[PDB]
Design a protein around this ligand. Structure first.
Ligand SMILES: FC(F)(F)c1nccc(N[C@H]2CC[C@@H](Nc3ccc4nnc(Cl)n4n3)CC2)n1
Lengths: 346, 367
């Protein structure tokens, strides 16, 4: 089987304002991004999105989708299941939350089917208990019989959910040249064999074709020129710049990508300040001697380190100061990584 | 893997008194019974059940499951899916029907677990559209993580299931059922076969829902060696007893052979044959009448020239030829012994003999 393209949207919600915080999404989203990139997927990896942001990320993912394209959604964070429908809880959701505060996976699926995708894969790494505060009754709009829908649930209905358990098992099997349903069924068996017994994968599938995440991508279509120019603008990393001060001191300002919305700034001889107010860069979390202290996935072997984890909140250009203890110098680094696409426009 | 026992309940609803009639459940249940028996399953195949009958049959089938038992439930008939929940429509169901009239699959599931089962397979051959009249949404307690439930839906949610020919689901399922593959792997390959078919495209597609975390197949051998299992083996032995063929001698010298054939666990064929016609008698006819009222037999679906005419799955070549056929479905309704009359008209001279053939097939168990 051939794929028109292979696109993936990975959302990892951890930093909940009015709900318990999560840890596993950081490790699981970074690691799944690496595995999917090895399978030649155009991956968009995003952490901690609000309702407004998640809906804009969904729309940006759909513009990357077309006829015969392989679509994959992976979510890890808070979730619930009511009347057959899966809901993904944004980090700005209140306590309690309703359907309107969250994103329904079936609504995304329907939009993906309207783009005539060749494959739809949903890997839902969340709890599947009911939300007793959600009064809403689904407006039953019968989905199309596309026979290319695969759901991979981390747990069974009404049950609970270093890597998280689901990613721990998924990692060891994801690269295999096997039909996605056969591969997920093997992952479910791996969990069954493991002594550490209580949690179980649930697979829902209407897939009628032998489609695998390993399938090769067909030759370039000659609107497809629109899709690939939008993509090549998604992961632009600022060029390492050398700074000159009036005292003769020279500092090298460097950048590294952690996620589509997460970039590490590192100064080598010197601290960074006056970042945009939309970015919510707490100066107590900036300029760490180690990248682990900043909350990064990146360890020291991957000077001073600062993590900008909310690039999706950037409306204008990334302009900030580089202070040397007294002198200051402004730097304009443009719109880095996913800030370059105006996702806010949706 | 190993099974302590392999048990299956097959329900085929067609003759609804308040809803359009169906055709495919007759051939599909018959054909699935054969294949499942070939996989050493104890099978109970029931045609046209009422709410009372369906609830009872399912209650008992849940009981039959013990630790490590392989249980398969198959339904073919009218169905619906409201807000995640699937419902099976009995033949006596009113117009319109509600959940309180139908059997919820999400309920049956919960009661299979409480019996510590080894594999639970649910094959639902029905439409999954919503019922606008069901102004009630059941909310069931957290699905117990037994990690051994496999659901095979003929079609997708909000879509329809399409069709002596098989329905689309059985047409593809019968070709693979006997393969030595994990039930999830097997169902997935049938989904692929359905996909290759010109007729199905954009209309019907099998949907599989599985939580099976072990290499379990319908081809797994039976092991386990229990007192309770012997009771079920004793009860199931009684269940499919067919009356032995009898010869009735009349006053005029005409001998008539009365024969029986099992069609389903609750469906029996009765046939009459003139075995001896004295040269003197040229034109003679034998016919069956005065059957128990519990059975509800149309006398215009009795004493037919061909078995096909009685509404049977069995063709003229599937039984002894040059006879008269009477089909008795509704054996689950028979409370007393099966007593009827055998009439003989010969050129017109009439005579009769009363016949008692005990409690045939499912009627041998009190229900
Ligand atoms: F006919 C109805 F009206 F539907 C009706 N009314 C009432 C009950 C009923 N029970 C049904 C038919 C008999 C079956 N008894 C067995 C026994 C052992 C065993 N071992 N393997 C298998 Cl299989 N069985 N089945 C259980 C289901 N049916």
């Amino acid at each position: 089987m051939l794929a028109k393209d292979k696109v993936a949207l990975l959302i990892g919600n951890m930093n909940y304002r009015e709900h318990p915080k999560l840890k596993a999404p950081l490790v699981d989203v970074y690691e799944l991004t690496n595995l999917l990139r090895q399978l030649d997927f155009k991956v968009v990896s995003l952490l901690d999105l609000t309702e407004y942001e998640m809906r804009n990320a969904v729309d940006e993912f759909l513009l990357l989708l077309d006829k015969g394209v392989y679509g994959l959604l992976y979510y890890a964070g808070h979730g619930y299941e009511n009347f057959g429908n899966s809901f993904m809880v944004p980090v700005d959701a209140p306590n309690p939350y309703r359907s309107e505060n969250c994103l329904c996976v079936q609504n995304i699926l329907k939009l993906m089917q309207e783009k005539e995708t060749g494959l739809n894969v949903f890997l839902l790494d969340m709890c599947r208990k009911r939300n007793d505060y959600d009064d809403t009754i689904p407006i039953l709009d019968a989905l199309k019989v596309t026979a290319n829908i695969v759901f991979g649930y981390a747990t069974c209905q009404g049950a609970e959910a270093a890597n998280g358990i689901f990613m721990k098992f998924l990692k060891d099997r994801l690269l295999e040249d096997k039909k996605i349903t056969v591969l997920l069924d093997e992952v479910a068996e791996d969990m069954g064999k493991c002594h550490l017994g209580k949690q179980a994968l649930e697979i829902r599938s209407s897939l009628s074709e032998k489609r695998a995440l390993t399938d090769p991508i067909q030759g370039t279509e000659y609107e497809s020129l629109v899709r690939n120019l939008q993509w090549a603008k998604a992961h632009e990393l600022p060029e390492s710049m050398c700074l000159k001060f009036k005292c003769g001191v020279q500092i090298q300002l460097g950048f590294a990508a952690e996620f589509s919305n997460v970039m590490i700034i590192y100064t080598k001889i010197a601290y960074v300040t006056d970042f945009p107010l939309d970015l919510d860069i707490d100066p107590k979390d900036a300029n760490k001697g180690t990248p682990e202290e900043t909350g990064s996935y990146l360890v020291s072997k991957d000077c001073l380190y600062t993590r900008l984890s909310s690039l999706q909140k950037l409306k204008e250009e990334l302009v900030f100061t580089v202070c040397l203890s007294e002198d200051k110098q402004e730097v304009n680094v443009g719109k880095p990584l996913i800030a370059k696409l105006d996702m806010h426009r949706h």
